[PDB]
Each structure stands twice: as structure tokens, then as C-alpha cells.
Design a protein around this motif. Structure first.
Motif, short mmCIF file in Angstrom:
data_model
loop_
_atom_site.label_atom_id
_atom_site.label_comp_id
_atom_site.label_asym_id
_atom_site.label_seq_id
_atom_site.Cartn_x
_atom_site.Cartn_y
_atom_site.Cartn_z
N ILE A 85 1.06 -1.21 -0.15
CA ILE A 85 0.05 0.01 0.09
C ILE A 85 0.92 1.22 0.00
CG2 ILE A 85 -1.70 1.41 1.13
CD1 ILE A 85 -2.79 -1.43 2.53
N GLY A 86 2.12 1.21 0.53
CA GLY A 86 2.91 2.01 0.58
C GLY A 86 3.58 2.51 -1.01
N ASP A 87 3.64 1.47 -1.79
CA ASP A 87 4.13 1.61 -3.14
C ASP A 87 3.03 2.50 -3.82
OD1 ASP A 87 6.27 -0.18 -2.71
OD2 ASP A 87 5.37 -1.90 -2.95
N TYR A 88 1.80 1.88 -3.41
CA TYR A 88 0.44 2.69 -4.27
C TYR A 88 0.55 4.04 -3.88
CZ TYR A 88 -4.41 4.13 -4.52
OH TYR A 88 -5.48 4.78 -4.85
N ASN A 89 0.83 4.43 -2.33
CA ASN A 89 0.48 5.84 -1.98
C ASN A 89 1.57 6.66 -2.57
OD1 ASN A 89 -0.75 5.16 1.45
ND2 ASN A 89 -1.65 4.85 -0.55
N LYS A 90 2.75 6.14 -2.93
CA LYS A 90 3.99 6.80 -3.40
C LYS A 90 3.52 7.27 -4.91
CE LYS A 90 8.57 6.38 -4.96
NZ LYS A 90 9.67 5.69 -5.40
N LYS A 91 2.84 6.51 -5.50
CA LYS A 91 2.25 6.69 -7.06
C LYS A 91 1.31 7.69 -7.01
CE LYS A 91 3.99 2.33 -9.34
NZ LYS A 91 3.36 1.36 -10.46
N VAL A 92 0.56 7.87 -5.86
CA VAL A 92 -0.52 8.56 -5.82
C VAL A 92 -0.28 9.99 -5.42
CG1 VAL A 92 -2.57 9.29 -4.50
CG2 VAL A 92 -2.35 7.09 -5.24
N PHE A 93 0.96 10.11 -4.55
CA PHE A 93 1.65 11.61 -4.16
C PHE A 93 2.37 11.84 -5.30
CE2 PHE A 93 -0.09 10.88 -0.37
CZ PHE A 93 0.69 10.06 0.75
N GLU A 94 2.76 11.18 -6.30
CA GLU A 94 3.58 11.54 -7.50
C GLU A 94 2.70 12.29 -8.46
OE1 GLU A 94 5.38 7.88 -8.26
OE2 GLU A 94 7.32 8.53 -7.36
N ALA A 95 1.53 11.67 -8.47
CA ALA A 95 0.47 12.15 -9.62
C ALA A 95 -0.21 13.60 -8.86
CB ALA A 95 -0.68 11.04 -9.52
N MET A 96 0.08 13.86 -7.59
CA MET A 96 -0.27 15.11 -7.23
C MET A 96 0.70 16.33 -7.63
SD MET A 96 -1.50 14.18 -3.29
CE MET A 96 -3.02 12.99 -3.21
N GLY A 97 1.54 16.01 -8.29
CA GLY A 97 2.74 16.86 -8.64
C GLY A 97 3.71 17.35 -7.70
N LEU A 98 3.46 16.66 -6.70
CA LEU A 98 4.85 16.92 -5.67
C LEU A 98 6.01 15.89 -6.04
CD1 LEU A 98 5.89 17.72 -2.86
CD2 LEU A 98 4.99 15.29 -2.32
N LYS A 99 7.22 16.81 -6.22
CA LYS A 99 8.57 16.07 -6.25
C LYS A 99 9.11 16.13 -4.97
CE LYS A 99 12.33 15.18 -9.54
NZ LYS A 99 12.83 15.45 -10.78
N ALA A 100 9.57 14.92 -4.71
CA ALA A 100 10.27 14.51 -3.38
C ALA A 100 10.82 13.35 -3.31
CB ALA A 100 9.07 14.97 -2.03
N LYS A 101 11.48 13.13 -1.88
CA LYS A 101 12.28 11.92 -1.95
C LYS A 101 11.21 11.15 -0.92
CE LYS A 101 16.05 11.46 -0.07
NZ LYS A 101 17.12 11.82 0.88
N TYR A 102 11.19 9.84 -1.30
CA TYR A 102 10.26 8.84 -0.61
C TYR A 102 11.06 7.67 0.19
CZ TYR A 102 6.65 10.94 -3.44
OH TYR A 102 5.89 12.13 -4.27
N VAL A 103 11.24 7.83 1.59
CA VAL A 103 11.79 6.75 2.38
C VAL A 103 10.96 5.99 3.23
CG1 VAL A 103 13.82 8.55 2.38
CG2 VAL A 103 12.22 8.59 4.11
N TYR A 104 10.98 4.90 3.08
CA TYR A 104 10.28 3.74 4.05
C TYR A 104 10.92 3.80 5.46
CZ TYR A 104 7.50 2.27 -0.16
OH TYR A 104 6.90 1.87 -1.19
#
Lengths: 309, 309
Positions: A85-104
Motif C-alpha cells: 500500500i506504501g508503493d501505491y501511496n507513493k504513485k498517488v503522491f507523485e500524481a499530485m505533482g509533488l516532487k520529493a524523496k520517498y523513504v520507507y
């Protein structure tokens, strides 16, 4: 407006404002937020990412902490599932136009030096403070489990390892963030967003049926759920439809109303919509129809960005 | 006597006796005990190592868990310092004639899979049970810290990783061991030794001045501390001198007493010494002098083995 005022807009509090000003002067600064992986990414999440975008535009490097390890401690299920679900959430945040680092969390949160820092902090932290900071995060629980008092220390330790100057989150996080300001050498600047009322009108927006608007909901789902939401005539306080209008809509805005019956009202700003609704000139039905349509437009790019993948 | 009876001798309880019998039938079996590193290795420790020796002779492979990580959680100070005392304790146990494996808690207790098992168990363990199992191990503490409820789960997890069929320890450990029997797939057989009364007569034998006999104490230190110890005439219960006579001395034993005043009493067994002391025929002064001398002989090899290094 400048950077400080843009950042401050639509927040419940900043701890503290002066400390934020000092941070802003720096050539390099960072801001992080933690999300326990959620099956649905709703407007509650969006509101916070929007704030991360504001910080990003103010020169902040953004880090999204996907708190899988933290969810596991919060009884969200198994790691493998949570991780997915964390993988899915990452793609959703990316679709929001936010560029950032994602750390588990589990990426560094299982390392020797990390775990050791957890135990050290646990030596400094009283059970009383720990449970206290989990009141707005846990369900109280009949008989609390050890995992509950470990959770806040894991979050505090995550903030330390991310190394962010600013810590963003909801107002439910404020006790853990105050703990963080006490436990860590570097006092992190805390920016807290307001709590978004669920569509039911009964508390925060959650994954309970019909209580949320998912950023990836279909137009018919958006319309249906907006239609059957809590929205008494003239009532602004606790009105989830008014909150959505306040935090997500662009103004000036033109509300479609049947001619003669209205008709078609052009609102210059949220403050105008507010008085119009409070004076009962704007009926709930019309407010809902407009919000539903605007929301469809606003969330469309996100929804189509995920569909294209 | 056989293996079971030799093992059972001088223990407060076995959980459970039948389970121990089943273990004994196995070609390969193991037994472990955990010690938080202690500056002084006293008769309290010795009594337990003596029991580990009995198990060793019964075909058990012995593992000594040097709980440095556990001591750290029990507020024993810093790891580096604690680790150094763990090195010292290892050489003292080796001088006791016990051959075994020595594993530090921090050796595997900081690994990813280990730490993850800690959090899983913390999900299963209630704060109530955790604090309860720490009553005879902690100092209650004004405001308990998170580290206290993590400790019992770390010990339970250590027992799991060591993979021992038997878990040996003092009666203060019994609540953590009952927890272990509940939390782990393999129900460990629990052998608990009695609590040795300190020389002061006020509770267990500890590192408080004059309350202990260190296995490496010099003859004059042994004599002095035995001389000024709690030992009322005719009183056996709570008499640390009688306990030392019971658990450490060999019989038949000849007690030196001034001729005419005694003189020189040959005791066939502890039970004889008991009735002799309870009937007041054996005076505290004579009992002390004999125990002091026997102890000097008994501990001599250990003390000289450490001096030779």
C-alpha cells in the motif's frame, strides 16, 4: 505574498513562527511528513501534500516518510501488505505533482544504530508521556499493548534520521512532535495542518464508507458522496462541504443555479461564499452541486495521471 | 542419583517437571541463563552457575547469555562500559569450571530480523503484563520509562534466538519466563533457583557494601564479611550463613571449636548442622568461623585461576 505567509496559509499552528523565519533564510532547508500507508488517499492527505507543495516552492527539499514500520506498530497488519500500500501511496503522491524523496521507515528503521537510538530514547521517555502522545492516534485500546508506547519513539527517531528542519503533519501529531522537540538535539520546526471533517460530519475524514473523497474517485462517486454528506443550511462550523470549499477551491468561482430559481451566482472568494451560505441565500443543494463539479475538475489531472500509468 | 534428581536438587521450582523428563530423553539438548553484567560476581551468581554445571553433566549444552543490551535497558549505564564488565564476567564464569558458549545480547539483538520480532511480540504483549513481569527486576521507578516494558520482550526474544530447551534463572525471573512460555512457539522448560539472602539479612545478595561474598574476595575480606553478617542464635530462616552452608558446603564437615569449649564438632550433613544450630548447641561465632574457612577453600581455585591470568 512572500514565503512565510504562503506557508502559514491554512495551517492550525506553527511551532514556532520565529524559528521558521530563521530556517527560511538558509540556502538549503528540508521539510518532511509521515504517512502510514492508507488504502485510500483522500482529501485529508491531499490537504497536507498541498502544504508540502507550498514548502517545496519556498525552497524546501521535501521528504515523504512512508511509515510502514510505524503502521505495523499501529496494528495496521503485516509488513508485506503494508509495504504494498506504501508503493501505491507513493504513485498517488507523485500524481499530485509533488516532487520529493520517498523513504520507507523500514529502510533505515531496522538498522543497528537506529534501533539503538530507539532504546536510548525509550530510556528518556516515560510511559505516561508516550501513551499521552498517542491519544489522538490510537483507539485508546481496552488493554494497551507495548507496541503503542514504542510507536511515538519510532516516529521521533524517524524525524531525527530524516534530518529535516521542518516537520509537517496534522494536529493529532502535535504531542509526538512536542516530544520530538524535547528528545532530539535539533529542535524541529513543526507545521500542523487543520483536521478535515469527514463527509458524515462525525469526526475526521477516514476510510469509512462514504466518509471520504478519494483523489482517484470517479465523477459519479464524487457527486454521490457529496450529495449525501452532512451539510445543514446556514451551518458553517463542522460543515465538511464548507471546509472543502475553503481549502481546495479556486476563486472567483461561479456556482450554477437554475435560472429564476437563483440564478448562477458568482462568488469572488471563500469569505463571500461563507456569508452567502450563513445568510441562507445559498442553499445546501446548490453548494453541493458546485463543490462536486469543482472537485471533479481539481482532482481530474491526478485521477487521469494514475489511469495513464 | 540420576539426572533429573541431580538437576532438581536445590531449586525452587521446575516448569514443568514432566516437560523436563521429555527433554532429558533427547540425544541433544541445551540450557541457557542470562546475566546482566555485574561488577561483582558473588555467591548468588555462583549458585546459578553451579546449577548450569549440573545441567552440563546431564548432557546439556550450556549457553551463557551476557545480557548487555538488557542491562542497558535496565539503566545499567552505557553499552561500552557494560560490555567491558561482560568481558570480565565471562572470565569469572570460565574460572568456575563451567564450559559453555557465551553470547552477548547485542551480538544478534540488533539484527533486522531480531528487532522485527521484538516489535511483533510487543504487539502481542500488554503494558500491564510487561510492567508486572518487571516488579522483582526493576525498582518500581517513580515514573516508569518505556525502556522498562521493552526489557521483558527483549529477554523473551533472546530465549527464542538462543533456541534452548531449558531456561535457567532466579525466582525473580519467573514472570518473564511465564511470558516466554506464552509468547514463543517452543515452550521452554523453566528451572528457577532460590533467592540467596544477602549478608545484611535485608533481602537478596547484592553489590551493596558487605552484603555479598565475591567469588574473588580475599581470605580476609571473606572472614570479615562473614563475621559481621546477620546470624541470630538458633535462627535458620533468613539466616544467610545457614543458606551458604546449605548450598555451597561439602559434608561431612568438621567445625573447629576450642577444646573444652566445644570442642571440634563433626557434622555429617547440612540437616545435622541445622538441628544443631536450631537447638543452640552450635553458636553463631563457631558457625561463622567454619563457613568462612570452608568458603575460602571452596572459592580458592576460582580466585587463583583468575589471579594466574
Amino acid at each position: 505574498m512572500d514565503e512565510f505567509e504562503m506557508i502559514k496559509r491554512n495551517t492550525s499552528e506553527i511551532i514556532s513562527e520565529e524559528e521558521l523565519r530563521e530556517v527560511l533564510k538558509k540556502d538549503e532547508k528540508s521539510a518532511e511528513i509521515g504517512f502510514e500507508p492508507s488504502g485510500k488517499i483522500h482529501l485529508g492527505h491531499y490537504l497536507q501534500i498541498k502544504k508540502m507543495i507550498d514548502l517545496q516552492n519556498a525552497g524546501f527539499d521535501i521528504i515523504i516518510s512512508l511509515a510502514d514500520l510505524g503502521a505495523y506498530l499501529n496494528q495496521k497488519g503485516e509488513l508485506d501488505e503494508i509495504r504494498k500500500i506504501g508503493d501505491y501511496n507513493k504513485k498517488v503522491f507523485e500524481a499530485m505533482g509533488l516532487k520529493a524523496k520517498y523513504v520507507y521507515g523500514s529502510e533505515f528503521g531496522l538498522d543497528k544504530d537506529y534501533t539503538l537510538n530507539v532504546y536510548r530514547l525509550a530510556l528518556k521517555t516515560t510511559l505516561k508521556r508516550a501513551r499521552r502522545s498517542m491519544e489522538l492516534i490510537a483507539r485508546e485500546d481496552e488493554n494497551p499493548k507495548v507496541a503503542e508506547v514504542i510507536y511515538p519513539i519510532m516516529q521521533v527517531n524517524n524525524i531525527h534520521y530524516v534530518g529535516v528542519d521542518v516537520a509537517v503533519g496534522g494536529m493529532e501529531q502535535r504531542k509526538i512532535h512536542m516530544l520530538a522537540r524535547e528528545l532530539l538535539p535539533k529542535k524541529v520546526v513543526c507545521i500542523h495542518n487543520p483536521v478535515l471533517t469527514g463527509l458524515d460530519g462525525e469526526g475526521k475524514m477516514s476510510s469509512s464508507k462514504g466518509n471520504f473523497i478519494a483523489v482517484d474517485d470517479s465523477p459519479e462517486e464524487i457527486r454521490a458522496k457529496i450529495k449525501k454528506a452532512y451539510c445543514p443550511a446556514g451551518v458553517v462550523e463542522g460543515n465538511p462541504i464548507m471546509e472543502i470549499a475553503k481549502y481546495f477551491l479556486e476563486y472567483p468561482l461561479t456556482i450554477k443555479r437554475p435560472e429564476k430559481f437563483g440564478g448562477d451566482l458568482t462568488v469572488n472568494s471563500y469569505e463571500e461564499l461563507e456569508s452567502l451560505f450563513k445568510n441562507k441565500e445559498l442553499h445546501p443543494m446548490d453548494l453541493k452541486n458546485a463543490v462536486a463539479e469543482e472537485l471533479i475538475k481539481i482532482l481530474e489531472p491526478i485521477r487521469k495521471r494514475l489511469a495513464h500509468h
